[PDB]
Amino acid sequence: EASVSFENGKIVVRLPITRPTSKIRVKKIENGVGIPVSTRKKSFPSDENLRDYYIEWQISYARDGKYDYELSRMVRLAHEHGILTYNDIYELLKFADDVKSYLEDKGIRRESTNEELYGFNIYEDVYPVAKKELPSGEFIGIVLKHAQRAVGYQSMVYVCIPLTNVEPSLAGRVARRNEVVKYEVPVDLMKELLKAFIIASETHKNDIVKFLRSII
Amino acid sequence: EASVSFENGKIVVRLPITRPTSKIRVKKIENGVGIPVSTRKKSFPSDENLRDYYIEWQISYARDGKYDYELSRMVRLAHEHGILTYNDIYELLKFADDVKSYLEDKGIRRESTNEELYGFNIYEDVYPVAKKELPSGEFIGIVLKHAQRAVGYQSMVYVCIPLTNVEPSLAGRVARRNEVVKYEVPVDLMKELLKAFIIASETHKNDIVKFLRSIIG
DNA sequence: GCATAGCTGTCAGCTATGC
DNA sequence: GCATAGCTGTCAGCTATGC
Ligand SMILES: Nc1ncnc2[nH]cnc12
Numbered sequence: 124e125a126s127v128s129f130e131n132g133k134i135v136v137r138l139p140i141t142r143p144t145s146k147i148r149v150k151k152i153e154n155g156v157g158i159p160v161s162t163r164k165k166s167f168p169s170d171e172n173l174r175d176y177y178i179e180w181q182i183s184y185a186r187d188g189k190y191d192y193e194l195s196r197m198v199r200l201a202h203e204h205g206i207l208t209y210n211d212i213y214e215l216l217k218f219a220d221d222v223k224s225y226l227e228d229k230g231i232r233r234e235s236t237n238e239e240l241y242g243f244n245i246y247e248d249v250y251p252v253a254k255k256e257l258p259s260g261e262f263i264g265i266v267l268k269h270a271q272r273a274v275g276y277q278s279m280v281y282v283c284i285p286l287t288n289v290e291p292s293l294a295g296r297v298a299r300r301n302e303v304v305k306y307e308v309p310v311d312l313m314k315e316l317l318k319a320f321i322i323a324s325e326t327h328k329n330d331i332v333k334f335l336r337s338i339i
Numbered sequence: 340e341a342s343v344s345f346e347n348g349k350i351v352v353r354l355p356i357t358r359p360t361s362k363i364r365v366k367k368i369e370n371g372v373g374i375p376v377s378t379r380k381k382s383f384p385s386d387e388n389l390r391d392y393y394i395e396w397q398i399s400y401a402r403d404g405k406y407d408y409e410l411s412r413m414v415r416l417a418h419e420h421g422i423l424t425y426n427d428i429y430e431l432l433k434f435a436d437d438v439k440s441y442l443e444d445k446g447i448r449r450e451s452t453n454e455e456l457y458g459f460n461i462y463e464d465v466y467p468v469a470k471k472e473l474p475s476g477e478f479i480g481i482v483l484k485h486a487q488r489a490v491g492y493q494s495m496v497y498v499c500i501p502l503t504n505v506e507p508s509l510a511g512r513v514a515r516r517n518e519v520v521k522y523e524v525p526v527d528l529m530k531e532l533l534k535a536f537i538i539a540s541e542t543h544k545n546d547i548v549k550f551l552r553s554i555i556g
Numbered sequence: 557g558c559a560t561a562g563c564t565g566t567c568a569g570c571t572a573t574g575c
Numbered sequence: 576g577c578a579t580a581g582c583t584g585t586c587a588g589c590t591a592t593g594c
């Protein structure tokens with residue numbers, strides 16, 4: 124339900140904010156950890172406190188093994204209009220050429236504590252995270268966690284967009300039935316997203332490199 | 340696909356070990372955490388390293404709004420056949436009455452590091468875990484993680500049984516097509532399992548308490 | 557014989573459905 | 576208008592289905 128278009132010299136994306144179990148989830152990110160939000164029941168703050176509210180998007184890039192879906196389309200569209208240039212892609216390919224390690228290589232561990240809870244010993248499951256933040260507010264998270272349907276752990280890439288960066292302003296009120304917000308995607312966000320996939324896993328890198336070399 | 344029966348003075352559970360996406364999964368311990376295992380492709384060690392392979396079972400207790408399913412049935416049969424006494428249940432109910440805090444009350448946090456990865460800053464997501472290990476080999480884990488289909492995080496209770504405690508011994512070979520192992524359940528495992536739910540969350544406690552009370556009558 | 561479709565943890569928000 | 580059924584992140588192991 125993510126619609127990517129090109130309006131007024133900008134790559135525009137329209138995101139649904141009422142599907143808490145989709146790949147596009149509204150979360151209140153405080154203390155670093157994302158917490159679910161009932162957009163249809165809880166009215167958003169009207170203060171400057173709207174900065175704590177992000178849109179967690181596990182962005183796609185492949186469909187029918189063709190690489191013309193969401194991120195891949197955004198990149199293609201950006202390339203078509205001369206926003207993303209040859210040198211921009213050449214940088215990314217040069218960047219991927221030097222990548223030897225990935226987040227997926229990092230391991231999950233269970234650490235012990237001296238705390239107890241009614242006879243039970245307290246431990247901590249520790250999952251590795253790679254994260255880059257953009258000055259405009261958006262940040263990109265690469266999180267190692269279990270696959271939703273498959274077996275094992277993968278690097279998950281999330282694009283997190285603060286609600287202060289989208290329109291209309293959700294401040295002071297509640298999300299409407301099937302409400303969709305509009306978001307102008309900066310080109311720098313795409314490059315860092317591509318970098319994020321490149322360092323996520325060797326498999327992701329090979330896909331991105333293949334895709335980028337196909338449009339040079 | 341988890342059958343529970345009473346045989347020869349013991350509670351016996353038969354577990355399928357070729358469904359790695361079910362609530363019964365075979366995992367190999369590694370740095371404290373479990374790693375998935377393709378039982379149909381892996382020749383289990385004939386060595387003494389088989390004690391590092393366990394059966395992760397996200398055990399159930401409710402169905403159709405009635406508590407006669409897996410764990411709940413196990414408890415009923417144990418009490419009916421005089422393996423779980425009234426004093427055992429009082430001891431558990433008294434224990435539940437003294438619980439004011441739960442694992443679900445603990446918080447998830449994202450810690451920072453001084454480590455990087457090609458410009459990206461490395462962080463660590465830390466989820467709380469409550470664990471209890473029986474001297475027999477089995478251990479029980481209570482893990483705060485996201486719900487599979489629902490929204491948000493909740494306490495997950497897993498029963499971890501080492502393969503060295505079940506029959507037959509899979510040492511040396513790979514698993515068979517739809518192979519099922521047999522495991523006799525200790526009372527202490529049943530008792531500590533109930534405590535786990537009791538401290539997992541306030542909702543689980545009310546379930547266990549209502550269940551145990553219905554048994555006495 | 558051989559390739560793969562199609563199912564696959566104890567659960568909550570939202571809305572199309574059915575009336 | 577209202578109560579609720581039934582859908583719901585980018586993916587792998589296993590085995591019955593298809594041929
Ligand atoms: N094993 C389990 N883990 C988490 N929640 C549960 N509810 C019932 N059984 C459970």
Ligand SMILES: Nc1ncnc2[nH]cnc12
Pocket residue numbers: 180181182183184185278279280281585
């Ligand atoms: N956003 C994403 N996160 C993880 N894996 C992916 N594969 C394709 N898109 C992905």
